[PDB]
Ligand binder design. Sequence first.
Ligand code: PC1
Ligand code: 3PE
Ligand code: LMT
Ligand code: LMT
Ligand code: SF4
Ligand code: SF4
Ligand code: SF4
Lengths: 51, 94, 318, 52, 155, 176, 145, 115, 44
Amino acid sequence: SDGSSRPYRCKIKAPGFAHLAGLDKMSKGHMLADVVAIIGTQDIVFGEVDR
Amino acid sequence: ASATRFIQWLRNWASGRDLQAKLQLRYQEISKRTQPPPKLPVGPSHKLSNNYYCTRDGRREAMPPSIVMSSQKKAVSPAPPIKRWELSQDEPYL
Amino acid sequence: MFMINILMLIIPILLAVAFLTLVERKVLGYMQLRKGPNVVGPYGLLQPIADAIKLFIKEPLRPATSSASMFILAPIMALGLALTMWIPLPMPYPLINMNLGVLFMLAMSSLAVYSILWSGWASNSKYALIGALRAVAQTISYEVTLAIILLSVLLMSGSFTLSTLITTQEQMWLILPAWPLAMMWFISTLAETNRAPFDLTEGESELVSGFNVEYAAGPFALFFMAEYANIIMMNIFTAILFLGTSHNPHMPELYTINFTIKSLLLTMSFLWIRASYPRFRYDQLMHLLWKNFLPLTLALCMWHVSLPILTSGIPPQT
Amino acid sequence: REKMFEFYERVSGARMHAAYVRPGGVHQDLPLGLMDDIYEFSKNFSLRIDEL
Amino acid sequence: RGEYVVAKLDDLINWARRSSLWPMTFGLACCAVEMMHMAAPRYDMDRFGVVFRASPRQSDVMIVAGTLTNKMAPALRKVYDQMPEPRYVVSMGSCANGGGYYHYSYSVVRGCDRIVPVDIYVPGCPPTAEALLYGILQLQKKIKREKRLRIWYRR
Amino acid sequence: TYKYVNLREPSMDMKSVTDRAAQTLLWTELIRGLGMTLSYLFREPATINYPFEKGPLSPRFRGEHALRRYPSGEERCIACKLCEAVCPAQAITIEAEPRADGSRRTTRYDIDMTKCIYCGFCQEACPVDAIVEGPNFEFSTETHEELLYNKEKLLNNGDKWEAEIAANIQADYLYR
Amino acid sequence: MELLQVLKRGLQQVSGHGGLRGYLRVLFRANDVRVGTLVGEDKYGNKYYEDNKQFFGRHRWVIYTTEMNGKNTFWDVDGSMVPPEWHRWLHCMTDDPPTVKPPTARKFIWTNHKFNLSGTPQQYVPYSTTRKKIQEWVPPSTPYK
Amino acid sequence: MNLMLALLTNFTLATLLVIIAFWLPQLNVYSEKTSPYECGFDPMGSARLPFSMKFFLVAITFLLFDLEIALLLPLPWASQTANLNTMLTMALFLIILLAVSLAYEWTQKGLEWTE
Amino acid sequence: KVKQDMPPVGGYGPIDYKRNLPRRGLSGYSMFAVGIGALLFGYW
Ligand SMILES: CCCCCCCCCCCCCCCCCC(=O)OC[C@H](COP(=O)([O-])OCC[N+](C)(C)C)OC(=O)CCCCCCCCCCCCCCCCC
Ligand SMILES: CCCCCCCCCCCCCCCCCC(=O)OC[C@H](COP(=O)(O)OCCN)OC(=O)CCCCCCCCCCCCCCCCC
Ligand SMILES: CCCCCCCCCCCCO[C@@H]1O[C@H](CO)[C@@H](O[C@H]2O[C@H](CO)[C@@H](O)[C@H](O)[C@H]2O)[C@H](O)[C@H]1O
Ligand SMILES: CCCCCCCCCCCCO[C@@H]1O[C@H](CO)[C@@H](O[C@H]2O[C@H](CO)[C@@H](O)[C@H](O)[C@H]2O)[C@H](O)[C@H]1O
Ligand code: SF4
Ligand code: SF4
Ligand code: SF4
């Protein structure tokens, strides 16, 4: 806030942002169908990841 | 609700549960779609006296940050170490 | 009069296939707390007709990168071979009475795999290629165990003739003396028909549509008709193998009714299984067959060679 | 999930983007009879988890 | 009579196409959640003959369910082009309709109809699952009105 | 407090080991799962018969917009522009002037329904209950231009829907 | 036997709809042959039914008129044909049908409901409702120069 | 004859369905429509590039195992022999050597896919 | 007097939440015994 009635800056911290960044780490040594499972286990919604 | 007795028995047996006690389709236990009007309460500031705004003004009590050090004895941590969690006594193991 | 008999086999097959698509969507729907098609015709009875007309007036596409001749050939092979699987089936009389009907069915099942391999390869797209190579793995997984499971059963029937299985099971269903093989046979037919939980060559949630991702309209319909025809045909085969219907030579239609009911229920079981389970991983399918079914199938094959000899109950050659 | 969307719509008028929780509290108070219906839903829900 | 025949043939193909609408498994943002609720048991879009299929080659309708950004625009146009014809586009929600809450963003396409032709516009943010179903039934009644063979006959 | 979701040791007594062998070989836990889907086959489905049946809604539902009148027929809107100021989407456009009788009334009142996020802030902001979100949600159109509402469209909506809108406001205005 | 009682209810539905012709009309128009209590009818011919033994969401329903506002709606029905007075009841925004609790009358309320007119000649077309802002000088009609 | 007539009819029926499928519908062909599919973005590299096979050793073993069943399928007929002592011994011998070969490949980690 | 949505005077009735997967089925011995019994009858 800068004192006015409009926010000066609003950074949104999305939990899925950091989770998806770890997808490559988590998928090491796995097959394609496991990557499908790993995407679901992180519970990613791109409304928050992308903003 | 309209299932015959044998069909209720069959699906009860197949699922291993008594499905008639907790049907997932709603019948008449739900609220009526027309309700009496409400009469909502008022808040603590609804008074005719002893209610000056300057004594209940949260925004005007906000202050600029305290400068601890600027560039113009025992060690400490940010807070005490977190207490260890205890196991649930409701159901410790799933 | 033989040409009439051919048409009275394949016209009904395709009609049964069309209405199996409706039945699957209704059965899945009710198992999913919904209804499924019930608007297009009463109780959705015209829905298969709408889909069929829709697809065959849809624009068919030949992908720019595809190998044209093989692209067209594969769907023609798929449906052609699917209909060929039905000709030796005794219901109770086969259209074609073969001495080695079982071996014929095995060979034609192997040839039908190439309609998956060539369609996927001819599409010249990555998801299509991945789907086709999953079919290679699937075939490697089940084919050896599938043949030896049949062999163990035929050691009680005594011949490779499909009609002999009726004679073999006149007193009692073969499911009794060979329920372990029936268990493993039933799973093998799911893998053989690319059916859930072994729907890997299409694997929608992984490969979009796998081997047939580039197919549209009528060419796509041919692949759908083929797979659903094979699903029905393999459950008729399962009924003949393990749930033999008694045959009265003077009332052959009583056999047909009893046998048709059994084949339908086995087909309903395929849909039921699809509604119930998650999908395998295609390397886990290969390990299922080779590390579990094959050791057991080899042991049971040894047992079913010895058992007739030790009990003095070897079946007649004829 | 569809029945819980009804709770959203009954407090806010929207099934999804309620815009109901605001700095200072909430936009409107619960309509009469809503807590009864949440109780009916919650009573049966654990059985649904069991089926899953 | 030629007219009577092509009139009846138009009814048949129009009936077949609207009775068997296969949307592409294509969703973009929040609006895709309501699209999921149309497939869910309460509305059961499958019961109208509406079935999702992943491949564009096997899809008849594109439901643009959510914001279309500039980075995504070429991909949406690609999968639309790859649908065989006849093909239809249903624009779902304010974002797809005209940009919505993000109309003034540097990264958003102000309406998917800048990218693809649109047959039906479903308003809302998001439209309820029932509102989307109303839009699909509206698409069906549009297909029912088509006069391809009648116009061909009079060419 | 916490609990462990998966920290249990299987017992090794011969009965338990055989119970697990039967599970592995006879597929008992897979058969059990088939039972659940079978029970659902015989449950009545949750599907409603749209459009002959409709999903339930409440008086607060935020749908298509409408401009309202007083019982006399005069417009409630007095061109204060509070709805225009609050609109998160800048979906509202307003112009105003003294009417021929001197009244403070709008000459333009547009809502871009493809910009609007159907948030209801405009009706919260309105001091005279002029702009509302009505209960209609079945107004999808074949063209984009049909969703750019001007004052004539919004007034027609109010006249079209006032019977329902007034009853919905009657049910909920004591929560506002 | 219960399986017999079930078959009796199914046959009661054929008579409850006024015979096989009435039973087939509703089966092909609405894909539903249930019988409910006639709650009321509106001026366009829509008939409204309820059955409180059905589960919530299936306990009210409308059989749309076959002709509304000059349009043949025997096969073409849509949810926008329900007028506002019945719209509240059909969507369970209220428990009271307009028969019991009629809406407040106003002289400016539409006497004739209209359904969705998109795609037709009656469709709404947007335009600017404001008058021209700048007035241009008009030159004289006489020569003088 | 009956067999050749049946095969010809089936594959002719399939061919006619394809002929109708291509010549009945209205076509509109352009470059973007016929481009290869890959979820909206253009493919990176040809689909003809080598695709590594991680089950290559099982695939070769399938060839050897698939010939074993050719040796075993005659067993129903061999059971009609009068010399049942020899036949039973050789039948069991062949199947055991198949099991031994399976156990060897299993214990040597031939059935695990290359990672 | 004030009227707003409130719980009933004594509160709401108890609400289950803990996992409940009932124990069903015969033992491994009985199930294998039935399987072998069927096999022996089949062989005979
Ligand atoms: C299990 C198998 C199921 C098979 C299902 C078979 C479908 C049964 C229903 C058939 C309905 C009649 C076909 C109409 C659909 C035609 C597709 C279409 O929409 O085109 C619009 C087109 C519209 O063309 P247009 O001239 O108006 O405009 C298109 C050109 N531009 C783009 C510039 C505007 O119609 C036609 O061109 C001709 C219509 C003729 C309808 C009669 C069809 C005759 C069939 C012979 C075709 C010749 C090839 C032989 C094929 C085998 C014959 C059976
Ligand atoms: C007198 C002396 C007699 C001597 C002979 C005695 C022989 C009988 C005793 C031998 C044992 C009998 C049972 C043999 C059946 C085959 C058992 C089997 O192979 O199951 C094991 C398999 C692997 O399970 P898994 O836990 O993943 O791995 C094990 C650890 N590596 O598990 C699986 O297969 C999982 C399969 C997953 C896919 C299942 C999808 C369908 C499930 C429902 C089917 C229901 C069955 C219906 C059968 C219908 C038959 C027509
Ligand atoms: C890796 C190498 C593994 C090699 C394993 C080899 C295992 C071989 C086990 C022996 C198999 C045959 O076992 C043998 O079968 C014959 C007939 O079938 C039996 O013989 C019995 O039946 C035959 C006729 O059927 C009579 O002639 C004979 O008088 C009678 O004893 C023997 O009593 C039995 O010992
Ligand atoms: C006469 C036919 C019937 C007899 C059975 C013939 C087939 C015998 C199969 C192999 C038997 C021994 O060979 C096999 O060795 C490997 C060691 O890596 C073991 O395998 C080990 O790792 C694999 C993969 O994780 C798993 O099977 C298992 O978790 C573990 O035991 C098998 O448990 C053992 O079965
Ligand atoms: S229109 Fe509304 S609900 Fe739909 S994607 Fe955009 S913001 Fe989300
Ligand atoms: S509902 Fe919200 S976005 Fe729409 S016009 Fe009103 S204030 Fe603007
Ligand atoms: S807030 Fe109400 S009175 Fe003010 S301009 Fe908007 S509609 Fe008119």
